Amino acid sequence: KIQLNATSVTHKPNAIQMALSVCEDLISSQVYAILVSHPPTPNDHFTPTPVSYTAGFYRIPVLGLTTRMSIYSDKSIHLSFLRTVPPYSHQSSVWFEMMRVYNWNHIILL
Amino acid sequence: SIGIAVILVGTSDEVAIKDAHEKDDFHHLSVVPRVELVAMNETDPKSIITRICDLMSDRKIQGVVLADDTDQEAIAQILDFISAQTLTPILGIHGGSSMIMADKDESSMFFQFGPSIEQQASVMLNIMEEYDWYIFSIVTTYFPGYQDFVNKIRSTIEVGWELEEVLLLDMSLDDGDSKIQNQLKKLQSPIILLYCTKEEATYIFEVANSVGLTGYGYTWIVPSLVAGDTDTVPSEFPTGLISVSYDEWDYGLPARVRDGIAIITTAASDMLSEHSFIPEPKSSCYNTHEKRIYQSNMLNRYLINVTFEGRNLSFSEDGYQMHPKLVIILLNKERKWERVGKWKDKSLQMKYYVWPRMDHLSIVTLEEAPFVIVESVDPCMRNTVPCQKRIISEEPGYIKKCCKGFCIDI
Amino acid sequence: ESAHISDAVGVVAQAVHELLEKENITDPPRGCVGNTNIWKTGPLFKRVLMSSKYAD
Amino acid sequence: GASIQQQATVMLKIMQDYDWHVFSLVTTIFPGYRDFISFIKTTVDNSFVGWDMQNVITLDTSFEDAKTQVQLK
Numbered sequence: 001k002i003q004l005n006a007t008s009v010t011h012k013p014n015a016i017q018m019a020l021s022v023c024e025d026l027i028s029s030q031v032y033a034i035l036v037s038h039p040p041t042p043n044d045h046f047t048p049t050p051v052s053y054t055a056g057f058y059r060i061p062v063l064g065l066t067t068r069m070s071i072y073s074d075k076s077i078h079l080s081f082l083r084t085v086p087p088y089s090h091q092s093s094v095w096f097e098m099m100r101v102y103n104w105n106h107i108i109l110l
Numbered sequence: 111s112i113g114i115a116v117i118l119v120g121t122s123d124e125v126a127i128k129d130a131h132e133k134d135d136f137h138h139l140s141v142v143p144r145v146e147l148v149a150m151n152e153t154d155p156k157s158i159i160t161r162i163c164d165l166m167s168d169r170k171i172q173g174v175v176l177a178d179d180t181d182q183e184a185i186a187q188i189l190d191f192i193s194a195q196t197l198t199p200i201l202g203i204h205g206g207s208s209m210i211m212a213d214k215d216e217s218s219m220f221f222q223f224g225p226s227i228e229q230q231a232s233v234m235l236n237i238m239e240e241y242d243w244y245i246f247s248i249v250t251t252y253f254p255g256y257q258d259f260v261n262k263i264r265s266t267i268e269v270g271w272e273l274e275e276v277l278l279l280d281m282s283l284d285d286g287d288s289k290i291q292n293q294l295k296k297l298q299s300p301i302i303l304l305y306c307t308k309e310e311a312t313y314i315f316e317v318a319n320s321v322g323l324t325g326y327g328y329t330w331i332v333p334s335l336v337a338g339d340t341d342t343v344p345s346e347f348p349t350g351l352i353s354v355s356y357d358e359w360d361y362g363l364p365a366r367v368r369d370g371i372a373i374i375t376t377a378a379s380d381m382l383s384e385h386s387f388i389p390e391p392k393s394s395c396y397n398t399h400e401k402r403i404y405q406s407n408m409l410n411r412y413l414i415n416v417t418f419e420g421r422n423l424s425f426s427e428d429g430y431q432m433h434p435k436l437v438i439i440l441l442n443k444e445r446k447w448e449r450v451g452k453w454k455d456k457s458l459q460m461k462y463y464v465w466p467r468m469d470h471l472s473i474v475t476l477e478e479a480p481f482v483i484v485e486s487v488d489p490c491m492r493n494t495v496p497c498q499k500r501i502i503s504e505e506p507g508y509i510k511k512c513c514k515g516f517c518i519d520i
Numbered sequence: 521e522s523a524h525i526s527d528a529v530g531v532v533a534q535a536v537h538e539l540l541e542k543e544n545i546t547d548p549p550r551g552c553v554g555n556t557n558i559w560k561t562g563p564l565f566k567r568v569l570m571s572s573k574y575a576d
Numbered sequence: 577g578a579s580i581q582q583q584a585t586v587m588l589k590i591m592q593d594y595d596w597h598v599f600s601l602v603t604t605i606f607p608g609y610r611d612f613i614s615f616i617k618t619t620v621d622n623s624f625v626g627w628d629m630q631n632v633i634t635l636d637t638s639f640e641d642a643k644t645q646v647q648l649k
C-alpha cells in the first residue's frame with residue numbers, strides 16, 4: 001500500500017527566490033529525498049547548496065547527480081548531502097595507478 | 111541619518127534597551143543614526159526573511175542586529191547567507207546569534223560577539239597551568255570546528271605537558287554504544303577534555319556513567335557551547351564540571367545593543383569620511399542582484415577596527431571579536447553554575463588560591479640556607495617544588511614561590 | 521541523465537522499502553509555520569542509506 | 577594424584593626454569609582459593625628468585641565488565 005507521488009520544480013535565474021520557493025514547496029510537500037540534475041547551468045557557480053542546507057536543517061538526505069566539486073564531500077558542513085558521481089580527487093588515485101603502471105615517482109603538481 | 115534595525119525575539123527588556131539606546135556619545139561626528147526596534151518570533155527562517163525584506167524596503171536598512179534566546183546555531187548559519195547576499199551588514203550579539211559557526215562567506219558582512227576556538231583553548235590551557243595538572247586527554251565529535259581546536263592545542267603544547275590519549279567519536283552511526291564504551295577504556299589521565307554538542311554531551315555522559323569514569327577522581331572541562339544556557343541544567347552533568355562562558359552577567363543586552371549601534375555608526379562615519387562616500391544603495395528586497403552594484407569593499411575594512419573610548423571592539427577576519435571578556439563556571443553539588451574566576455588580556459585570575467576537591471597531608475617548613483632554598487617564580491622550573499607564602503597586611507593573600515634544597519630532595 | 525535518473529530513482533525506491541521494514545516511522549513537520557524541531561530519524565535514515573547495497 | 581599445593585610448586589618450578597620473574601595473580605570465587613593464596617605467599621618469601629608479584633586479581637561475580645575490567649586493565 002505504499003504510494004509514490006511525484007513533484008518537481010522548474011528553473012528561475014535568481015537564487016534567493018529560487019531557494020525560498022524550493023523550501024516552501026518542499027515543506028508543504030513533506031518530501032523524503034531531493035534530486036538536482038542541472039549539469040548545464042548558464043551560471044558557472046554550480047550552487048544547489050541552499051537546498052542541501054535547508055534539508056540539513058531537518059536532517060533530510062540529499063543525493064547529488066551532476067556537480068563533482070569536493071566542497072560537497074565535506075560532511076561537517078554538508079551534514080545531509082550525498083552524490084553518486086565521484087569528485088576529481090579519484091582522478092588522483094587514477095594517476096597514482098598510472099604511476100604504478102609506468103614507474104613514476106617524482107611529479108610536478110600545479 | 112543611517113538606518114539601523116534592531117530585532118528582538120523572546121522575552122527581553124525592550125523598554126530598557128530603548129531607553130538605553132541613546133546612551134552613546136555620537137555628537138562628535140555627523141551620523142544621527144536612525145534605529146528601529148521590532149519584535150519577532152522563532153517561527154521559521156522564511157518569516158525572518160520576510161521581516162528583514164520589509165524592514166530594508168521600508169526604512170532602507172543599512173545594518174541588522176539580531177538577538178534571541180534559543181540554543182540553535184542555525185540562526186547565524188542562515189543569517190550568513192543574508193549578510194552575503196545583501197550589501198547591508200548584519201551583527202549578532204546574544205542568544206542564538208552568538209555561537210560562532212565554521213566560517214563566514216567572502217562577501218559576508220556578519221560579525222559576532224565572542225571568542226574564537228583558539229582563544230578558548232588558550233584560556234583552558236592557562237587554567238591547567240594555574241593549578242598544576244599536566245596530564246590530560248582530548249575527545250571530540252565530528253562538529254566542523256574540531257580540527258582547529260586539536261591543532262591549536264597541539265601547537266600550543268608543542269613545562270612538562272604530557273598528552274597520552276586523543277579520541278574521535280562519530281555519533282551519526284547508531285548502535286555504537288558498546289563500541290563507545292569499549293574505546294573509552296583508553297582514557298587514563300585524571301582530566302579529560304570534550305568538544306561536542308549538548309545532546310551528544312548527554313549521550314556521552316550516559317556512556318561514562320555506564321562505565322563509571324566520572325565519579326570522584328575525574329573532572330571534565332568543556333567549551334561554551336556545551337553549557338550555553340545557565341538557567342537549564344541537563345539531567346546528569348557530573349558535579350564539578352568546569353567550563354568557560356561569555357560574560358553575560360556584567361554585560362547585559364542594552365550594553366550589547368549600544369556597542370553594536372556605536373560600531374556600526376563609527377564604521378559608517380569612517381567610510382563616509384576617509385573615502386568621503388557612504389555606500390547606501392537602493393535597499394531593494396526584490397531582485398537583490400541589481401542592488402549589489404555599489405559594493406563597499408572598504409566598509410568591512412573599516413568594520414574591523416573600532417574603539418569605543420576604552421573598549422577595543424575590533425573584529426577578526428573570520429568574523430569573531432578580538433578582545434572578548436570571559437568568565438569561568440563550576441558545577442557545585444546543587445545544579446548551578448558559580449563564578450570562580452576571570453580571564454582578560456592573557457591574564458588569569460582565580461578567586462580560590464587552591465582548587466577545592468570533590469592520602470593528602472599538608473606540610474609546613476622554613477627556609478634554611480643549604481636545605482630549603484626559596485626563590486620567585488619564572489617571570490617554577492624543573493626539579494623544584496611550588497610553595498605558597500601568605501601575606502598579611504584584607505582577604506587572605508598568597509604568593510607562589512619555588513622551593514628546593516637538600517631536605518626537599520629526600 | 522536518462523540512465524542516471526533511472527538508477528537514482530531505483531536506488532531511492534529500494535532504500536525507502538528498506539526503511540519501511542523497520543519501526544519508528546517519522547514524517548517531517550510543516551517547517552514553514554512555527555516548526556523548528558528536527559526530524560528525529562534523520563541520522564538514523566542516513567545510516568540506513570549508508571549500508572544500502574545494490575545489483576541494478 | 578596430587579593436591580593443589582604440589583601442583584602449585586611444580587608450576588613455580590616451571591616458571592623459574594624459564595626466568596619469567598614478573599607475574600600477577602587472578603583468582604575467582606571458586607572455593608579453595610585462599611589456601612592457594614597463602615601457599616603462594618609462603619613459597620615466594622623463602623625462594624632464591626625474588627619474584628615480582630603484581631596485586632592479586634579477585635573476581636566478585638560473573639564479571640559485569642564495569643568494575644572488573646578496571647582490575648583486568
Ligand SMILES: *[C@@H]1O[C@H](CO)[C@@H](O[C@@H]2O[C@H](CO)[C@@H](O)[C@H](O)[C@H]2NC(C)=O)[C@H](O)[C@H]1NC(C)=O
Binds near residue numbers: 005006007008
Ligand atoms: C501529489 O503531488 C502534486 C504535485 O506534484 C500535488 O499537487 C499540488 O497540490 C498543491 C496543494 O493543492 C498545489 O498548491 C500545487 O500547485 C499542486 N501541484 C500540482 C502540479 O498539482 C498533489 O496535491 C499531491 N497529492 C498527494 C497524493 O498528496
Ligand SMILES: *[C@@H]1O[C@H](CO)[C@@H](O[C@@H]2O[C@H](CO)[C@@H](O)[C@H](O)[C@H]2NC(C)=O)[C@H](O)[C@H]1NC(C)=O
Binds near residue numbers: 414415416424432
Ligand atoms: C587600527 O588601526 C591603527 C592604525 O593602523 C592600528 O595601530 C597600529 O597598530 C600596529 C600594531 O600594533 C602598530 O604596529 C602601528 O604602529 C599602529 N599604528 C598606529 C598609527 O597606531 C591599530 O592597531 C588598529 N587596530 C586594530 C585592532 O585593527
Ligand SMILES: *[C@@H]1O[C@H](CO)[C@@H](O)[C@H](O)[C@H]1NC(C)=O
Binds near residue numbers: 522523
Ligand atoms: C545512456 O544510457 C542509456 C540507458 O542505459 C543507454 O541506452 C544509452 O546508450 C546511453 N548513452 C549513449 C548515447 O550511449
